[PDB]
Amino acid sequence: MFVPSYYAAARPEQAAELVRSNPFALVVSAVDGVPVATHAPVILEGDAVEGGTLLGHMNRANPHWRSFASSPDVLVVFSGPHGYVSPTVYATDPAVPTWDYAAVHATGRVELAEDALDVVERTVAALEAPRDPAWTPTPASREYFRALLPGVVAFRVRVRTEQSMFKLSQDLDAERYARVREAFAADNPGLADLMDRSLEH
Amino acid sequence: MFVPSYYAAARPEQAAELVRSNPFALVVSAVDGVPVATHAPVILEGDAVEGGTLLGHMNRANPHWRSFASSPDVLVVFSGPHGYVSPTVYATDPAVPTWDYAAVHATGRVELAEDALDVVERTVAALEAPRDPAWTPTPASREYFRALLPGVVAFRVRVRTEQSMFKLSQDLDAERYARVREAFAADNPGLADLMDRSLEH
Ligand code: HEM
Ligand code: HEM
């Protein structure tokens, strides 16, 4: 990822806010020099992505984690709202399309997590906390968790570098910007809100 | 990515339909052994992903493409609808959450494309065609495209291996499946639609 100045994060907290809001991540590593990716829920431990620690888990029958000793460098991609910008919206002639999106790339070294149970239980707490009502695992479900544990592999990423893209049409003049925002306000309200958050002082 | 049999595509063309429906892809390669990703529009050439050819483009100022010169293997991730499955929806005890999603991973050797104009023009046509109305580039926009070309780097991926995940709760019994589908029918109609298409003969 390359981040133009106009699409940099405005506030430092924005990257961590994106990570916490979009936990279903892509875990990417080099298995024998070839990239391999797994879609998995990953949560953030700490106030900031960079220097922070990510926790996740995957299927033990998924062979991706078997590379985590040999190929410890990993990339985790967190994806926020995104949407196509059609020149139809701009209402200008000569025009070119683009795609607006927010994403955070966290690169660090991966390691296997011994306490898999803690990882998945904290993942439950994090995803249920914003829902109403929240699901609280019963004692029977916690017993079920223990029984499922041989089938999971938990892992930790110590994040060395964090890269954040907030490509939200910030470079546009007011007329073309208003039209992009209005078009997303109807189709893609989550993107519209991110646009609004990107202009804050 | 590991795809259990019950989450495999029901029909082979389902993978290509996902790629065409979700062109805003993640292009991943090994820059100095570390995974590096660029979000870019990628389109499919051919009837099938495997054996097919992907076409995409990125910012020339994005140095990622400079690793594509050694013709290294790249991964292109296409991501369809997805959504968290809370045990609240299941309404059963002992339970465990999961995340439902569809994705296609295309792995091959990347090559820089000389005909960048053709790549970006076919990308326009492909992304505009299902919109209503579709944007038809005027002659002035075509000249604008030509003028923009020094800033773009186009590339092609000859796909060697393809993996498609349609993790859409098809392993649930009938009552729990109905509740999951009904819940997404309200929150996430794109995911609901994918579930219906996965059970079609
Ligand atoms: C809290 C939210 C959770 C989400 C969103 C989630 C999601 C997922 C996903 C996407 C996978 C596939 C990983 C892969 O492709 O390798 C997976 C695997 C797995 N997870 Fe979780 N999980 C959650 C909590 C838990 C808990 C509490 C447990 C208890 C042990 C658990 C146990 C498993 C097991 C056994 C597998 C592999 C076998 C299977 O897929 O059923 N998960 N999970
Ligand atoms: C058809 C839909 C299109 C979409 C969704 C799209 C999207 C994008 C995206 C996401 C980037 C950033 C790539 C990166 O981070 O490296 C980019 C860069 C770029 N694209 Fe496209 N593109 C489209 C068509 C075109 C066309 C027709 C041209 C004409 C030459 C073009 C020219 C460029 C240029 C010059 C850049 C450099 C960065 C910039 O100017 O923003 N694109 N495009």
The two most distant CA atoms of chain A are separated, in Å, by 63
Instruction: Give CA–CA dist B39/A75, Å, rounded.
Output: 14
Compute the CA torsion angle B88, B91, B95, B97 (nearest 10 deg).
-30
Instruction: Give CA–CA dist A59/B67, Å, rounded.
Output: 31
- Write b or e for each residue in A78-113: b if 16 or more Cβ atoms lie within 10 A of its Cβ, otherwise e: bbbbbbbbbbbbbeeebbbbeebbbbbbbbbebeeb
Compute the CA torsion angle B136, B24, B48, B137 (nearest 10 deg).
10
Instruction: Report CA(B64)–ligand 1 centroid distance (Å).
Output: 33
CB atoms within 10 A of CB B162: 21
Chain B: closest CA distance from residue A180 (Å): 15
Show the tokens assigned to B63.
Answer: 């140095």
Q: Which residues of B touch A180 (CB under 8 A)?
A: none
Residue holding tokens 């029977």? A140
The answer to whether residues A169 and A82 touch, using CB atoms and an 8 Å cutoff, is no
CB atoms within 10 A of CB A121: 14
Q: Which residues of A touch B124 (CB under 8 A)?
A: 97
Backbone angles phi, psi at A10, to 5 degrees: -75, -45
Among the bound ligands, the one closest to the CA of A43: 1
Chain B: closest CA distance from residue A52 (Å): 19
Q: Among candidates B193, B187, B195, B199, which has minimal Cα distance to B89?
A: B187
Q: Among candidates A163, A190, A177, A165, which has minimal Cα distance to A7?
A: A165
- How determined? X-ray
Instruction: Give CA–CA dist A23/A9, Å, rounded.
Output: 19
Backbone angles phi, psi at A88, to 5 degrees: -55, -40
Nearest protein Cα to ligand 1, atom 21: B98
Are B39 and A1 within 8 A, CB to CB?
yes
Q: Which residues of B touch A141 (CB under 8 A)?
A: 87, 93-96
Environment class of B88 (CB within 10 Å of its CB; exposed 0-12, middle 13-18, buried 19+)? middle
Chain A: closest CA distance from residue B90 (Å): 11
CA B90 remoteness from chain centre: 29
Peptide bond into A133 cis (omega under 30): yes
User: Is A82 within a domain?
Assistant: yes
H/E stretch holding B182 reads helix B174-187
User: Is B144 within a domain?
Assistant: no
CATH number at residue B57: 2.30.110.10
Instruction: Give CA–CA dist B150/A99, Å, rounded.
Output: 19
Instruction: Report CA(A3)–ligand 1 centroid distance (Å).
Output: 33
Strand-pairing partners, residue A158, are A53, A109
User: Is B26 within a domain?
Assistant: yes
User: Is A52 within a domain?
Assistant: yes
User: Is A109 within a domain?
Assistant: yes
How many structural domains are present in chain B?
Answer: 1
Peptide bond into A137 cis (omega under 30): no
Show the tokens assigned to A196.
Answer: 């609004």
Q: What contacts A139, CB < 8 A, 6 or more positions away?
A: none
Task: Tell me the one-letter amino acid at B177.
Answer: Y
Instruction: Give CA–CA dist B34/A159, Å, rounded.
Output: 13
Q: What contacts B174, CB < 8 A, 6 or more positions away?
A: none
Size of interface A-B (CB pairs under 8 A): 155
The helix, strand and coil proportions of chain A, stated in percent and rounded to the nearest 5, come to: 35, 35, 30
CB atoms within 10 A of CB A148: 14
Q: DSSP string of B113-180?
A: -S-HHHHHHHHHHHHHTTSSSPP---HHHHHHHHHHGGGEEEEEEEEEEEEEEEESSTTS-HHHHHHH
Final resolution, Å: 2.0
Nearest CA in chain A to B134: A88
**Domain boundaries, position A65:** 5-114+153-192
User: Is A198 within a domain?
Assistant: no
User: Is B183 within a domain?
Assistant: yes
Kindly calculate the radius of gyration of chain B based on its CA atoms and give it in whole angstroms.
Answer: 19
Strand-pairing partners, residue B100, are B83
Instruction: Give CA–CA dist B41/B76, Å, rounded.
Output: 10
User: Is A179 within a domain?
Assistant: yes
The runs of H, that is alpha helices, within chain A are 13-21, 87-90, 116-128, 139-148, 174-187, 189-198
Instruction: Report CA(A53)–ligand 1 centroid distance (Å).
Output: 19
Backbone angles phi, psi at B135, to 5 degrees: -85, 125
